[PDB]
Amino acid sequence: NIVTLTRFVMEEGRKARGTGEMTQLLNSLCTAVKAISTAVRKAGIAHLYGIAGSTNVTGDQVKKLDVLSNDLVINVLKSSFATCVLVSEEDKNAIIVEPEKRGKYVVCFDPLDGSSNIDCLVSIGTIFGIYRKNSTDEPSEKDALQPGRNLVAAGYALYGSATMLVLAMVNGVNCFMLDPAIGEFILVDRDVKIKKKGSIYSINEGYAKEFDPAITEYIQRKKFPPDNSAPYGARYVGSMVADVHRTLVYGGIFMYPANKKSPKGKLRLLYECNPMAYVMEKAGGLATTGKEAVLDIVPTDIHQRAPIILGSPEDVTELLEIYQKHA
Amino acid sequence: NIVTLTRFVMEEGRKARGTGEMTQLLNSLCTAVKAISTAVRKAGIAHLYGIAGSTNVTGDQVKKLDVLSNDLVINVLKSSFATCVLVSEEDKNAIIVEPEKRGKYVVCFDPLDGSSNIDCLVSIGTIFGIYRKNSTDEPSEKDALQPGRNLVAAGYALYGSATMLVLAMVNGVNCFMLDPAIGEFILVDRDVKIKKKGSIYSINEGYAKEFDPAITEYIQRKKFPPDNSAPYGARYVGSMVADVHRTLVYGGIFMYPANKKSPKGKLRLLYECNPMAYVMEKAGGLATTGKEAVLDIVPTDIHQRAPIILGSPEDVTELLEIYQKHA
Amino acid sequence: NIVTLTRFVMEEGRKARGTGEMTQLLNSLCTAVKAISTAVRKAGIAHLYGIAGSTNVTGDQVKKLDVLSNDLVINVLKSSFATCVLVSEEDKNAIIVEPEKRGKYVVCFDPLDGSSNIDCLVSIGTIFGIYRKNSTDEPSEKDALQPGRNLVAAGYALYGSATMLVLAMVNGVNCFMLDPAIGEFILVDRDVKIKKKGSIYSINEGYAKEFDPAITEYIQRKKFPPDNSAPYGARYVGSMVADVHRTLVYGGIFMYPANKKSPKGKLRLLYECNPMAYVMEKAGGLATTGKEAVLDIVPTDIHQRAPIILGSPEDVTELLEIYQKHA
Amino acid sequence: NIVTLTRFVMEEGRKARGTGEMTQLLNSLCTAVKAISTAVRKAGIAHLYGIAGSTNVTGDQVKKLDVLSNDLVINVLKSSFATCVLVSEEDKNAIIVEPEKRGKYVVCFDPLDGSSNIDCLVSIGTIFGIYRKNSTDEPSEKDALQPGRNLVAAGYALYGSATMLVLAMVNGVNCFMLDPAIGEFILVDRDVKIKKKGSIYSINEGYAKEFDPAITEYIQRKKFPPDNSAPYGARYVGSMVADVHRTLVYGGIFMYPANKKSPKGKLRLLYECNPMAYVMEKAGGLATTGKEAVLDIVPTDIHQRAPIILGSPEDVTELLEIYQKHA
Numbered sequence A, B, C, D: 001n002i003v004t005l006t007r008f009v010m011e012e013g014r015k016a017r018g019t020g021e022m023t024q025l026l027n028s029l030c031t032a033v034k035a036i037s038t039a040v041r042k043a044g045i046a047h048l049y050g051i052a053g054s055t056n057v058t059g060d061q062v063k064k065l066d067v068l069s070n071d072l073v074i075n076v077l078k079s080s081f082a083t084c085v086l087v088s089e090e091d092k093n094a095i096i097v098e099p100e101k102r103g104k105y106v107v108c109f110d111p112l113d114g115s116s117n118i119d120c121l122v123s124i125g126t127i128f129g130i131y132r133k134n135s136t137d138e139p140s141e142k143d144a145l146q147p148g149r150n151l152v153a154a155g156y157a158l159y160g161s162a163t164m165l166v167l168a169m170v171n172g173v174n175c176f177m178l179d180p181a182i183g184e185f186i187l188v189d190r191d192v193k194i195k196k197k198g199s200i201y202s203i204n205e206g207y208a209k210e211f212d213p214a215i216t217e218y219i220q221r222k223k224f225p226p227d228n229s230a231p232y233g234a235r236y237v238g239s240m241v242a243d244v245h246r247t248l249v250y251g252g253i254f255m256y257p258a259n260k261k262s263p264k265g266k267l268r269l270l271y272e273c274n275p276m277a278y279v280m281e282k283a284g285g286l287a288t289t290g291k292e293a294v295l296d297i298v299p300t301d302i303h304q305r306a307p308i309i310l311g312s313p314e315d316v317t318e319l320l321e322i323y324q325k326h327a
């Protein structure tokens, strides 16, 4: 029995007896993700190189993927009439939606994750976290400052060899594969669970000289297992969306701890850490900063940064033990 | 003036006064690559999941992506009437084209590189190397056992966020972006040259306990710069075609030396090492095993393996200097 | 403000306070129409001609568009869990859906209209009429034997230079253009109304020798206007979906009266005449058999045929006057 | 063995021992046609309707489909470095290619045929005819004023339910189906031949009061067969490229004789009449004005018009016999 994202969301909406506003918001997301996917795959690039004549700004004067993606997400989410506040990785201030388009939801998103991998064509993506506004006050940024544990839905779209949307809600994590031939997301994995233990560690070891003792010790074990067991294999794509997705399906651990240049970690709490921590906990995994649960941090800034360790429970647990081992 | 790959190959053929056979071969390669990417992006997957019933098929043909890609290369190249010997990473023996479809070119190809990243949707691709048959004798595997220096043309197609085919021939390297909307590869970078020195090192550090001393000394040097400069960033996609392409565009160094499981390295010489080595040297870069030039190795086995270090000249020679410092 | 079919239908569902079942059925229709559109445009035809090898039944042994379209519609509508009875132009008996998939709606459809235009690649399409089952009896064919005037929704998808879906419901007719680049239907025409009078007559004059006096007289006027005004132009695509769509947007009249071979007309009441008569009346046009309203006929057979005259009100009215003129 | 249009043109070039210029011209024509169809199918229309905002553009460039198609043909042909004189149904004067991009071929083309069917989404297309410059003089419109019999190659691309390019050259006619999924035209019918006699007549009968006696006598003969056989079916799409293509595949007769508004017929000789006439004769069919062969007319005006009757030999000669019976 074929099941598309469209049918799945609509039905989950019926089972929860929703009024239909969130379902409309998710349908908008779906559409946004497809438009970004098409532009990311370079559809119609021939026009920029003068196939129809008029080869004007054939350099850098037209929308760069980062910006185009941010416009699609904002414009589409707005037009869903289900949001009131929006937080983008590409915007300094929270985006307060006009009253005539205002909804009860707050969305925190990363329109195009994997910044440094854009020019080399490595996998990139979009990340999103949705909150139900809780307060009778007028829309402001504080409405997006809720701890991740208050997330109603979170997930991401991966633009890789193929495009896949991973959606996580109260009752589980579901994976949908995009069939570009018909512009439809097909459910291929129902209520997914990450393996208890993996054999892959993911981190940028270029910061070796800045790692804290716990991280430094953990890495030593993956390369030189004290029990002489087989060493973990290493993998680091460079785009958080890509590295987290492999972690979800293959197992293992992903890491981005603090360092000199980034004392509180590089990844942002609102639209990078929380959505992935939610997807991970719902899949049966763990997401810690090393001292606490990511979903428990009470955000104080819109672009606040936080250190994160996520993946299989046994692999993450072992690293927490190291942290405690170091007082 | 916009330049399509079809326009480019044909003109390069005219400038070389060829009979048109090599032109027909490249055109067929262009067609094969488009087909493989369309399949990689999962076009038509809804059918596998029963969108039109469950009797459309008369057998159980769930062809795995790697097999399907290999089937496409084989049939498409053969229908070009320009080849006589084919070596695939997928077949134990060389494939000898039937007399009627026989041409004078030898093609060594890697159907879909990045096998471990197929299920997690990370970038994968196809790598190729073309040689002229140099023997009046009847075509056999021997004609495929030539040193990389004899290549007339080599390259690859990358199926990442977007699909790009990179082709290198005697007169230089050129990158073409596939425009999925019209099924056309567009020339977007001419006579490409790699940076003399980069700031990214690429290797699977999970084999740390099995690396030779030269590799170990170099890694520490990237993490702890003796001149005290900023340490190189680390990147390891897990797919050679992917990691090699970023090395070309961003500069830096890619490494896959020998280890316990692979005493002579893991990567294959004919359709992995050689093609990428030729692309690199043509871009003014380097590619060595650590003791000699990859393109100079005369193979004795079509599936022979070899250790490889490629990338920016200054980066590679620095490592080559560590090797020759020990021994 | 961008509006997609997905958002439009969902919203109309909210305004009517529906439970969500019909909305799910319409979403299924939308998906069906896209899959048919892709197969109609010949996506992936390269495989049938041996691009990946195995050129077996390269003649006539695989699904012909007529059949493939009928499978997609049936399978998709079934999987929507909103139907109980289905009437297809390609099936002799009414299709009674399994209890575990049963809904309250009855759908009458023409999966691929324009049979004779398939091989010459002329415009073809899909037509549909939806009824809300009215009776506590068990699902049977009689449930689809309701007069067109009981239609809850009707319309068609036109596979022409571009693909467009025309949807008609109680509050109007709306036209949606398909953007194949993202697999999304975009609303381009809101609540459309046909012009009071056109300048185009559409009919197969090859049956001249069989036309009744009224038709014969009417045609004389279009070619030789008694008042010496400019003559109407003639247009006959051959596919009902194509001819009716032009009629809706340009105005004029479309005709398929009785003849020798077809004493009661060739076009079928259930899935050709009623849906178009409904779309036409909702757009402000007329649909008569010459003696009565199409939407008023009480069907007695599932594949019953009926004569039809449709289009601008003034053009249709004038022909009715001729009929009365002839007692 | 699967045959792509790219493979076919190149090989036909090799067999003819050409320098490769005409091969490069045809390849460019292949590229242009793909681009036009992708635009015709409305790829990317969501952008026009603001899916990404309302500031993406820096001007008002709502290029109409016919203008865009003309822009593509002009720029793409010129970037082929194989032409010197271009005549478009869209430009009052011939376009003389700049000396640097000058080649020896003359191309007469119809950017998008079927203008009256553009808004109603009925089939439309592009028609072309190629000639060799036959004059050492400087290129001018005169080089485009040659009799149809001098064509080296002619054909058209049909954008109907699917896109098909038909190409006719000295050795016969061949049809290629565009596979939108890989952007490749597939050879699906070789050395095509029209039926000696069909059963469909195609003409706009809205000009009945302006037809000459021969045309009138023939129409009555199709409606009232003197031998009392079954009357021919009528078909008139309104787009020449469409009606002509069905005539080729199904056989029969197509007609557009002279009338009051068009004393010398409406259709243009250089890029409408001639190309279709050449395709027809090569398929063993006929094409006359009623008094002479279309391919024999020596034009004096690039936008000159001419009456035309084409199709199955027996059908056309029957009409040619009515003409020569009167006068």
Ligand SMILES: Nc1ncnc2c1ncn2[C@@H]1O[C@H](COP(=O)(O)O)[C@@H](O)[C@H]1O
Pocket (backbone or CB within 6 Å): A009, A010, A011, A012, A013, A014, A016, A017, A018, A019, A020, A021, A022, A023, A026, A104, A132, A152, A169
């Ligand atoms: N499509 C849906 N999928 C899952 N939960 C939903 C859906 N629609 C509504 N809900 C739940 O019902 C709540 C209220 O929905 P709404 O009335 O649309 O704002 C949401 O916050 C969700 O917890």
Ligand SMILES: Nc1ncnc2c1ncn2[C@@H]1O[C@H](COP(=O)(O)O)[C@@H](O)[C@H]1O
Pocket (backbone or CB within 6 Å): B009, B010, B012, B013, B014, B016, B017, B018, B019, B020, B021, B022, B023, B026, B132, B152, B169
């Ligand atoms: N399209 C082309 N691009 C570059 N070099 C070519 C091309 N076609 C032919 N050549 C060169 O000319 C030689 C002979 O070509 P051929 O007669 O086609 O086998 C090839 O081995 C190449 O060195």
Ligand SMILES: Nc1ncnc2c1ncn2[C@@H]1O[C@H](COP(=O)(O)O)[C@@H](O)[C@H]1O
Pocket (backbone or CB within 6 Å): C009, C010, C011, C012, C013, C014, C016, C017, C018, C019, C020, C021, C022, C023, C026, C104, C132, C152, C169
């Ligand atoms: N999406 C919709 N668009 C228009 N009318 C609708 C929609 N959904 C429900 N309705 C109306 O409400 C009735 C009951 O809907 P349902 O409860 O889904 O069976 C339908 O028969 C329609 O008349």
Ligand SMILES: Nc1ncnc2c1ncn2[C@@H]1O[C@H](COP(=O)(O)O)[C@@H](O)[C@H]1O
Pocket (backbone or CB within 6 Å): D009, D010, D012, D013, D014, D016, D017, D018, D019, D020, D021, D022, D023, D026, D132, D152, D169
């Ligand atoms: N691709 C081709 N298909 C058919 N005939 C061709 C082709 N290329 C060249 N010819 C023939 O050879 C002549 C000279 O070709 P060229 O040297 O390219 O101008 C043309 O005018 C055609 O008659």
Ligand SMILES: O=P(O)(O)OC[C@H]1O[C@](O)(CO)[C@@H](O)[C@@H]1O
Pocket (backbone or CB within 6 Å): A113, A114, A115, A116, A204, A238, A239, A240, A241, A256, A266, A267, B233
């Ligand atoms: O080069 P670094 O420090 O590993 O940064 C990579 C990280 O940057 C990001 O692009 C965020 O800026 C993440 O997607 C990725 O995990």
Ligand SMILES: O=P(O)(O)OC[C@H]1O[C@](O)(CO)[C@@H](O)[C@@H]1O
Pocket (backbone or CB within 6 Å): A233, B113, B114, B115, B116, B204, B238, B239, B240, B241, B266, B267
């Ligand atoms: O898991 P490892 O040892 O890092 O191997 C990865 C390598 O394997 C390959 O898939 C070839 O087997 C390459 O594409 C990639 O570089």
Ligand SMILES: O=P(O)(O)OC[C@H]1O[C@](O)(CO)[C@@H](O)[C@@H]1O
Pocket (backbone or CB within 6 Å): C113, C114, C115, C116, C204, C238, C239, C240, C241, C256, C266, C267, D233
């Ligand atoms: O050849 P005829 O008698 O005009 O039949 C054409 C009619 O047949 C149909 O294909 C239905 O069978 C209609 O779509 C079209 O109006």
Ligand SMILES: O=P(O)(O)OC[C@H]1O[C@](O)(CO)[C@@H](O)[C@@H]1O
Pocket (backbone or CB within 6 Å): C233, D113, D114, D115, D116, D204, D238, D239, D240, D241, D266, D267
């Ligand atoms: O409206 P009419 O007189 O039938 O003309 C239709 C003809 O006009 C054209 O659009 C050319 O002007 C042709 O494609 C078509 O055959």
Ligand SMILES: [Zn+2]
Pocket (backbone or CB within 6 Å): A089, A110, A112, A113, A114, A240, A272
């Ligand atoms: Zn990010």
Ligand SMILES: [Zn+2]
Pocket (backbone or CB within 6 Å): B089, B110, B112, B113, B114, B240, B272
């Ligand atoms: Zn490989």
Ligand SMILES: [Zn+2]
Pocket (backbone or CB within 6 Å): C089, C110, C112, C113, C114, C240, C272
């Ligand atoms: Zn029909």
Ligand SMILES: [Zn+2]
Pocket (backbone or CB within 6 Å): D089, D110, D112, D113, D114, D240, D272
């Ligand atoms: Zn025209």
